[PDB]
mmCIF file of C-alpha atoms and ligand atoms in Angstrom:
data_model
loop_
_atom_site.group_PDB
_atom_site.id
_atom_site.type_symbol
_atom_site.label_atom_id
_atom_site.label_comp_id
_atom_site.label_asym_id
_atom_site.label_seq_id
_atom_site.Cartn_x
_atom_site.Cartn_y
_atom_site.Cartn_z
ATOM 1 C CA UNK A 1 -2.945 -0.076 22.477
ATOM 2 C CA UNK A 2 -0.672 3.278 23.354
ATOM 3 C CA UNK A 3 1.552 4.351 21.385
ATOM 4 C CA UNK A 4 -0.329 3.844 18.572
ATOM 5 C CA UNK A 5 2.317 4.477 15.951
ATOM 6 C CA UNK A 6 4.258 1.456 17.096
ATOM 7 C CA UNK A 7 1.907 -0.900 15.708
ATOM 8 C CA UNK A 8 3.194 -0.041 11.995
ATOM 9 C CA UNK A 9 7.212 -0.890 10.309
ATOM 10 C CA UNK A 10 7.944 2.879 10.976
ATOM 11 C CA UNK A 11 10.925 3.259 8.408
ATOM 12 C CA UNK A 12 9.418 0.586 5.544
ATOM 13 C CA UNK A 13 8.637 3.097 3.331
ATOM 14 C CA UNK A 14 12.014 5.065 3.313
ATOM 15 C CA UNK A 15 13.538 0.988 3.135
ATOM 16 C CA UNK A 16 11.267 -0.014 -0.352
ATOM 17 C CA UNK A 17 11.851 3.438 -1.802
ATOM 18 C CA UNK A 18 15.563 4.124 -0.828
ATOM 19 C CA UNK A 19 17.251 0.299 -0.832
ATOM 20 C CA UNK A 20 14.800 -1.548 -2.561
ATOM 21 C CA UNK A 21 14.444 -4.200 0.332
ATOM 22 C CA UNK A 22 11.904 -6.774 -0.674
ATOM 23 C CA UNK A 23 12.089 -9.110 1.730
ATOM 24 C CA UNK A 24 10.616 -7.294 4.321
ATOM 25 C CA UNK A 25 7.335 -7.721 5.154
ATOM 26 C CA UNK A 26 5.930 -4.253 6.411
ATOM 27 C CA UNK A 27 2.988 -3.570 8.938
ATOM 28 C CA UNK A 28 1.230 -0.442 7.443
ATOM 29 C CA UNK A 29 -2.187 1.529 7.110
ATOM 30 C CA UNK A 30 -4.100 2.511 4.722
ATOM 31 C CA UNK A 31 -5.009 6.196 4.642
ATOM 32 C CA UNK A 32 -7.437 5.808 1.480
ATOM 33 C CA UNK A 33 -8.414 3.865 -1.573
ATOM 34 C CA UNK A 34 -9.123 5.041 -5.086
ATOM 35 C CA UNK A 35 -10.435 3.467 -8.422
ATOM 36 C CA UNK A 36 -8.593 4.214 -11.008
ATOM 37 C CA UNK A 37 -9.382 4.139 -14.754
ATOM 38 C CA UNK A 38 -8.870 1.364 -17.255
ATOM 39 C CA UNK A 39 -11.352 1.427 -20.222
ATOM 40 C CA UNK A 40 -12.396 -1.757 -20.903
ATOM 41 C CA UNK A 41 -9.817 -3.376 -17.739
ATOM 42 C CA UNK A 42 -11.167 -5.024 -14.753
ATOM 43 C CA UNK A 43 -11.035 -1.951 -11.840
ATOM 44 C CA UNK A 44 -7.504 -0.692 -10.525
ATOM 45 C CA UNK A 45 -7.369 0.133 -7.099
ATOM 46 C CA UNK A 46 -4.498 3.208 -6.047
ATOM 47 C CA UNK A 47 -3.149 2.872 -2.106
ATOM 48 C CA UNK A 48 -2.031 5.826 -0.171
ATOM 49 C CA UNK A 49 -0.417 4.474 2.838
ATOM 50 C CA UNK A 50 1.465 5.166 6.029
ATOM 51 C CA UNK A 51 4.026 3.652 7.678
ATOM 52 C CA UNK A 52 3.594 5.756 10.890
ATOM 53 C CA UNK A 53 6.525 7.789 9.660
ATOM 54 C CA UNK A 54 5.907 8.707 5.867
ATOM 55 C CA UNK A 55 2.964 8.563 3.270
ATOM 56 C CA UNK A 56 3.425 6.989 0.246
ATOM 57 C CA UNK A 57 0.848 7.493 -2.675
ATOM 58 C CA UNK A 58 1.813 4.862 -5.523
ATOM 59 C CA UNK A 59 1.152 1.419 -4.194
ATOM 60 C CA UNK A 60 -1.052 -0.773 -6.153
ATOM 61 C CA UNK A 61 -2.968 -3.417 -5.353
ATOM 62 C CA UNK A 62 -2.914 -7.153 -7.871
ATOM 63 C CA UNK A 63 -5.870 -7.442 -9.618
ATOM 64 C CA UNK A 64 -6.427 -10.737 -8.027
ATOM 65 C CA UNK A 65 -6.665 -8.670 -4.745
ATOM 66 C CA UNK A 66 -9.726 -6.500 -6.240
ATOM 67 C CA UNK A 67 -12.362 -8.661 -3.992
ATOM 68 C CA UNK A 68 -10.893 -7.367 -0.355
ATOM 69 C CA UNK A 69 -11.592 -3.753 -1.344
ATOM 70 C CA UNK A 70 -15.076 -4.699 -2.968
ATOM 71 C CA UNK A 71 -16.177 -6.597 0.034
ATOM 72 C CA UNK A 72 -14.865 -3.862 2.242
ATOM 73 C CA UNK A 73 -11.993 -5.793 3.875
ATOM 74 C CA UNK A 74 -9.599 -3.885 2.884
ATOM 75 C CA UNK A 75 -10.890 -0.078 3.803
ATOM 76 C CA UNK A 76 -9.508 3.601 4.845
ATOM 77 C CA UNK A 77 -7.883 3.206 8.574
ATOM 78 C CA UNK A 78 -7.226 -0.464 8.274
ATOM 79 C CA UNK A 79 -4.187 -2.445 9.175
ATOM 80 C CA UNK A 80 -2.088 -4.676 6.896
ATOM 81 C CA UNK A 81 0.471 -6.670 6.742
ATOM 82 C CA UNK A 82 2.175 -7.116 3.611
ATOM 83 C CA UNK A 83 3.817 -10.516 2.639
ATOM 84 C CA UNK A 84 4.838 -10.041 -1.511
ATOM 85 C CA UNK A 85 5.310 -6.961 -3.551
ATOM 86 C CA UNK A 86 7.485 -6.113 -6.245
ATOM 87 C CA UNK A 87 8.640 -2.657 -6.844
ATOM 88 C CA UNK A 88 8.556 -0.985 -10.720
ATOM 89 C CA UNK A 89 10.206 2.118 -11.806
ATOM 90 C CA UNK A 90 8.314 3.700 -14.804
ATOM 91 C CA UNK A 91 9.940 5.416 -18.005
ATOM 92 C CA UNK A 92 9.770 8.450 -16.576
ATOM 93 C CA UNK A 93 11.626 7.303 -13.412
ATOM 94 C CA UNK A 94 8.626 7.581 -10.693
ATOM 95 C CA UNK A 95 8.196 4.335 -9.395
ATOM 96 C CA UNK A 96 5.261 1.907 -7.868
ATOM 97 C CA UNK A 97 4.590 -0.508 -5.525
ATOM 98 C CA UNK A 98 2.261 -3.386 -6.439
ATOM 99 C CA UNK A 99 1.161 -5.239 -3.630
ATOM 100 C CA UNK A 100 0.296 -9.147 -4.676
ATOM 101 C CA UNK A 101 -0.121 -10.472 -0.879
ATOM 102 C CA UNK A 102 -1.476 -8.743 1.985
ATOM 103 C CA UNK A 103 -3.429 -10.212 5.178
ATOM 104 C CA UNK A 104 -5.518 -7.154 6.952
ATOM 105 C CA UNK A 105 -4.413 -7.191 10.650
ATOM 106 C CA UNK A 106 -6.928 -5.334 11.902
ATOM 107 C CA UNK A 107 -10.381 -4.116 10.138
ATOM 108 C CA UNK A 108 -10.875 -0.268 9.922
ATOM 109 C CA UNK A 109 -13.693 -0.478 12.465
ATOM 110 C CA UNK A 110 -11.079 -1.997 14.984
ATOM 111 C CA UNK A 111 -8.500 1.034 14.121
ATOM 112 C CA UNK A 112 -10.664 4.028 13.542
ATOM 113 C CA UNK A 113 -8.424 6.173 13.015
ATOM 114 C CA UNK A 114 -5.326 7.477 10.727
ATOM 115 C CA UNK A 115 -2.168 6.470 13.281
ATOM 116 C CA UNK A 116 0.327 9.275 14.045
ATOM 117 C CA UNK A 117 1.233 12.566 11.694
ATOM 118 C CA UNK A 118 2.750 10.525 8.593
ATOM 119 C CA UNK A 119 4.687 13.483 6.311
ATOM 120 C CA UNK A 120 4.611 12.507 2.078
ATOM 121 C CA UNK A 121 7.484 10.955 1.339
ATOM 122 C CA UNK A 122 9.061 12.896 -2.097
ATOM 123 C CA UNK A 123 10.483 10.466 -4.323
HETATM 124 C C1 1FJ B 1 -3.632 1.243 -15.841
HETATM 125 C C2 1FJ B 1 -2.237 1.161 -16.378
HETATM 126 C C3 1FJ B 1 -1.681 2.327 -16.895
HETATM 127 C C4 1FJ B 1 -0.393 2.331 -17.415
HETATM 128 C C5 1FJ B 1 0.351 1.162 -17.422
HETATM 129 C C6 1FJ B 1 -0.187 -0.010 -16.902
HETATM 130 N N1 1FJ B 1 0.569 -1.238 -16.900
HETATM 131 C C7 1FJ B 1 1.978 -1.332 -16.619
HETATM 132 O O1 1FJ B 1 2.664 -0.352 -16.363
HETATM 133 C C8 1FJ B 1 2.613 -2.685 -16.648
HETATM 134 S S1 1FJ B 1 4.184 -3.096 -17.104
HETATM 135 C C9 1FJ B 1 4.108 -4.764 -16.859
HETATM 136 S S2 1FJ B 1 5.501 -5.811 -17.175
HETATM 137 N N2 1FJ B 1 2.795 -5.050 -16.395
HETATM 138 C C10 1FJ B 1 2.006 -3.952 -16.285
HETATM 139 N N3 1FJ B 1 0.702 -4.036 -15.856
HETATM 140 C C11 1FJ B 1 0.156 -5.238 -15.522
HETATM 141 O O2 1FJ B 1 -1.002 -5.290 -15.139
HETATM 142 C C12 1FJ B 1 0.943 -6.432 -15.618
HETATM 143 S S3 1FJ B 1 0.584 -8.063 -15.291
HETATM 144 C C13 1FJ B 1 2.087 -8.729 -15.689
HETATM 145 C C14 1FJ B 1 2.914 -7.670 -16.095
HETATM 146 C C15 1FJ B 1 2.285 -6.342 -16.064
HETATM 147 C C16 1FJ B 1 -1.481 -0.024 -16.381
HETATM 148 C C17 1FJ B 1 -1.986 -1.337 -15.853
HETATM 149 C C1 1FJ B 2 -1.925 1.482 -12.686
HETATM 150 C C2 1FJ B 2 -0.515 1.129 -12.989
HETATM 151 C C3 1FJ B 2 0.321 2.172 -13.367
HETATM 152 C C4 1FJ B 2 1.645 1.927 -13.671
HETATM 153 C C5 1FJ B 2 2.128 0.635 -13.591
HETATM 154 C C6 1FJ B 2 1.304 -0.417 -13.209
HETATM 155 N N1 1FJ B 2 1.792 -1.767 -13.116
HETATM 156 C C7 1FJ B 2 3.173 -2.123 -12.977
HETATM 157 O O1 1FJ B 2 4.069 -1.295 -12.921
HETATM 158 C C8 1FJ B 2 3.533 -3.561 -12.873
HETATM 159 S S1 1FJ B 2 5.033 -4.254 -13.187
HETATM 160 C C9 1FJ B 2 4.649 -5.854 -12.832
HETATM 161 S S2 1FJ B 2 5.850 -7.129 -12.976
HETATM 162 N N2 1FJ B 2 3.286 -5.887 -12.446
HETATM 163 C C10 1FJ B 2 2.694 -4.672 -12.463
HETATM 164 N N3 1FJ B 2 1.377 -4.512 -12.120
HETATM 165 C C11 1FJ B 2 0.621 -5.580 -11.739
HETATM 166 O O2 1FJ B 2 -0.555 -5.433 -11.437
HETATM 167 C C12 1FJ B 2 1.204 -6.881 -11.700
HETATM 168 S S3 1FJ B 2 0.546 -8.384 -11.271
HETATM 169 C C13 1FJ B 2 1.934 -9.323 -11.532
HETATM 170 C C14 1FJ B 2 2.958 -8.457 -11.952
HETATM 171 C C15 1FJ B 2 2.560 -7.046 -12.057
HETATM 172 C C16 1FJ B 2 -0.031 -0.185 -12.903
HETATM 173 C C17 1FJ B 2 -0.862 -1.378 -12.493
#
């Protein structure tokens, strides 16, 4: 209940970007979810989400995930806990997450709302 913020890994995203832990297995929201394009792929879905201290804008969800988003599951404001990712660093040097198991702790109608003032985090 109060303290809302305490109900996500507050420091996870600093963690995956900074030391490259993998082993963790961090409790975050999602802020929003976006389609993103692939031709003639099977849909892409972009994460934005929040740790309750940062934002972080590159995670991607496993194909194999695709039906929590399309049967609404997985939604804007819900909570997640993730249990195997793998991080990639691109040739330009940015770098993604790709989430490949997640359980949703709570659905977005049981949250509501986005938890806390989460800043971007840059880089
Ligand atoms: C839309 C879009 C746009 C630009 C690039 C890429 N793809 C990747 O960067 C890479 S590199 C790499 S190893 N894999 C992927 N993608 C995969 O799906 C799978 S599955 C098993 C390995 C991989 C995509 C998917
Ligand atoms: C849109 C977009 C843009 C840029 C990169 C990438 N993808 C990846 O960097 C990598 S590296 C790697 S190992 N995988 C992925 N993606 C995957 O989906 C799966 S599933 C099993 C492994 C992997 C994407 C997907």
């Amino acid at each position: 209940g109060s303290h809302m913020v305490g109900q996500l890994s507050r420091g996870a995203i600093a963690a995956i970007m900074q030391k490259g832990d993998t082993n963790i297995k961090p409790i975050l929201q999602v802020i929003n979810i976006r389609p993103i394009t692939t031709g003639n792929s099977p849909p892409r879905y972009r994460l934005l989400m929040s740790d309750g201290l940062n934002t972080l804008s590159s995670f991607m969800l496993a194909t194999q995930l695709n039906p929590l988003v399309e049967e609404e599951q997985l939604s804007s404001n819900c909570v997640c806990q993730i249990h195997r990712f793998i991080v990639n660093t691109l040739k330009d040097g940015r770098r993604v997450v790709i989430l490949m198991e997640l359980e949703v702790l709570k659905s977005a109608e049981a949250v509501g709302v986005k938890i806390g003032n989460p800043v971007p985090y840059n880089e």
